[model samples]
Target: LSADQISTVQASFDKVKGDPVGILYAVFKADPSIMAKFTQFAGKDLESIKGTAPFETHANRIVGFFSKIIGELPNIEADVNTFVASHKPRGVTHDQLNNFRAGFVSYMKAHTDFAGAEAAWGATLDTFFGMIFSKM
Candidate 1:
């Protein structure tokens, strides 16, 4: 990414790195289509699942996955290749992830100092997801 873009994404993420649950909530809240990928959560109550082990597992997997990507952005090419291969086998499509990115951005906007964060996150996601779509 251009230096300006990368910094913007990193800055916003710096302010909201530990809130995985909130991030997943924003993701699902934005796009139910994502949740639909999993049979158990397809039509369940969002609040009920929020506290369950299963729910936490997936949220952690996804949001924590993002955290890992952000942390390793500089050397992420190979890792992202693995992520694309791993996720695609599990039915994680490019469209679904793009939707997740949009939803996550909306989540950040509603819950944090989002104006600058939005730009930053866009760049961050664009950089990482670029590898996923390209390799997948």
Candidate 2:
């Protein structure tokens, strides 16, 4: 991603980063199996679980991981590697990662000015997920 594209993507994320629960909701809505991977969330009604501490804790972990990556920018390689090393042992798959991208984009589309920022986000996800796939 170019500097300008990075700026665009980061600026857009700035608008939606505050609502982590809603973001996770969109994710589980896209694919319940992603929710299933979380022992605290599995097999429970989304609405019923959403406001609980366990759900919020998981949401913070997921969103904060993204925030850390997005915050680090060009120097994100090491962090990405660490992330892969941690998740790979948990049996995270290529499909789940792609589903995650789709879910984030789906949420951003509704919550942010995603139409204007789509290309930058595409490139950004491609870069992040590219590294992830390579490591996998």
Candidate 3:
């Protein structure tokens, strides 16, 4: 992504970065199986578990990972690699990853001033997920 694109994406992301729970909720709501992967969250009703502490902690970690990646911008390969090394062993699937992208984009659309950053986000995810899928 270009410098302008990175700035646009980051600025948009900053608006909702504080609301990690909302972001994770969008993902789990899009595909409950993703939530099921987490032992703590497994088999629980989303509405019931969403406001709990464990859920908040996990949500922060997930969103913080994204924050780290976005903060690094054009230098995200290492972070992406780190994610693959961890998740690949756990059997994270392509479908789940795609759903994650879908859910995240949905969150952005609903929560951010997305149009200005849409192309940047598209390119960013393409690059991020491209690296991920390549090694997976």
- Evaluated with lDDT, which candidate comes out highest? 3
RMSD of each: 2.1, 1.0, 0.8
Q: Which residue ranges in model 3 land beyond 4 Å of their true spot?
A: none
1-136, model 1: which lDDT tens digit per residue? 6667666767778777777787887788777887877887988988778778888788778777677777766678877877877777877777788888788777777777776566566667777778778877
lDDT of 3: 0.92
Which residue runs of candidate 1 sit more than 4 Å off their true CA positions?
Answer: 2-7
lDDT of each: 0.76, 0.87, 0.92
Q: Give the candidate order by descending lDDT.
A: 3, 2, 1
Per-residue alpha-carbon lDDT of model 3 for 1-96, expressed as tens digits?
Answer: 899989988888889999999999999999999999999999999999989999999999999998999998899989988999889989989999
lDDT per residue for candidate 2 within 83-113, as digits (tens), equals: 9888989898888888888888999988766
The TM-score of predicted model 3 comes to 0.97
Query: What's the number of clashes in each of the models?
Result: 2, 0, 0
**Candidate 1 structure, TM-score to reference:** 0.83
TM-score of each: 0.83, 0.95, 0.97
Higher-ranked by lDDT: 1 or 2: 2
